[PDB]
Amino acid sequence: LEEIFEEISPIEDFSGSMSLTFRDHRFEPPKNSIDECKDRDFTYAAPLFVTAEFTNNETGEIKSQTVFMGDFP
């Protein structure tokens, strides 16, 4: 997952102004146990976070934030 997050390079617009970078990915323990998922018709998954920072060159402004990318099975 770190390979596929680093594959998405910080992209640039037509003016080459913005950039966003997914530095680190991390996992939390699943909210439902395996027997809970089996019994109650759920999908055994854990939340997947990534630390995305938004950097603008013209303003010199960096916005580092953690965004929830989905329940990875």
């Binding site: 010199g60 960096i62 934030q65």
Partner: protein, 158 residues
């Protein structure tokens, strides 16, 4: 102009606190970056001091701010165009301007419009966002508690 431990108002995010001064080098130039954060979105903002005035940062206004925003909040004879599209295009521009007087006028007129008939559910999102950023701006200006900040405005907007 900017020190450590002080509170600074950043546009579209409200009041924020500065942690430390960063000396990251870009192309061999030691820019004087400063890092700040809010408690709303859990994000860190790094701004150099040279272009801080250009990006639109602004300090804490003292006793000269609450009285002027109250008197423009109590100012009568405010009118809007009959077509809702022109007012809709004007209000987000006034929000993006970042002026405290402008956002106070926008929230006062919008609240009056919601009181008289009731506008919609879509505009509730932006009224809520504007009230949140305005109460965050006034909360750290008077150094009052956030519940006290939202309570004190309840008896003055009528």
């Amino acid at each position: 102009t900017f020190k450590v431990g002080d509170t600074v108002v950043y546009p579209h995010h409200g009041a924020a606190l500065i942690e430390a001064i960063e000396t990251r080098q870009i192309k061999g130039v030691d820019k004087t970056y400063l890092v700040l954060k809010v408690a709303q979105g859990d994000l860190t903002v790094r701004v150099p001091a040279d272009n801080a005035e250009f990006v639109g940062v602004r300090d804490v206004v003292g006793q000269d701010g609450l009285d002027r925003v109250f008197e423009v909040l109590r100012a009568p004879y405010a009118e809007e165009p009959t077509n809702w599209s022109r007012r809709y295009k004007a209000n987000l521009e006034k929000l993006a301007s970042g002026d405290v007087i402008k956002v106070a006028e926008v929230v006062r007129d919008l609240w009056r419009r919601e009181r008289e008939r009731g506008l919609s559910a879509g505009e509730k999102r932006m009224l809520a966002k504007a009230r949140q950023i305005l109460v965050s701006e006034l909360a750290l200006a008077e150094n009052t508690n956030e519940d006290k900040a939202e309570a004190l405005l309840d008896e003055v907007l009528a």
